[PDB]
Design a protein around this ligand. Sequence first.
Ligand code: FMN
Length: 173
Amino acid sequence: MNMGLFYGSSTCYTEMAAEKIRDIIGPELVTLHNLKDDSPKLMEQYDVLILGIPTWDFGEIQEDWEAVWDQLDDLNLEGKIVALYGLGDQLGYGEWFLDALGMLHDKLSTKGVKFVGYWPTEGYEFTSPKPVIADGQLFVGLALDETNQYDLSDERIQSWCEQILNEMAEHYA
Ligand SMILES: Cc1cc2nc3c(=O)[nH]c(=O)nc-3n(C[C@H](O)[C@H](O)[C@H](O)COP(=O)(O)O)c2cc1C
């Protein structure tokens, strides 16, 4: 299946993660979409999607994601696989770490999607109630930080990619 990597970035952080995800999984079948210029309507075509939101200004969404957040309700995503990923920082926040991630998860759960890319919350710092499932033991998506985890965020992407490329494919078997 062809898969759509969607993101929005004010700087470059979500962009660099996007390149990595598509690269690791396979640019044969993954395609980047830069929502600060691309319309999310093309996300209706692709069988499977991977969507990435940075949490800005204390639990705000990145400003270019806010621009398409309106259309996401109108789109056809019903029965699509979605892997969420998100960016923030633990040291300055924790409380607002991945807050936008929880918001897309609650957005796209109403869109009748199926989700991949959970991680266990152990060995991380957040204590926020939003980006978590089960009993709060696993995150809704890949969680990154570029303010101090910049040394390892790269390694966490690839390992996340190594599961989502199974979770999506094994669903589709
Ligand atoms: C003014 C400002 C506010 C931020 N607000 C949050 C926040 O609410 N939660 C969080 O965990 N990180 C926060 N961050 C960290 C960013 O989410 C993080 O750097 C992210 O990678 C931004 O991605 P982007 O620039 O590609 O859009 C903030 C950063 C700045 C500069």
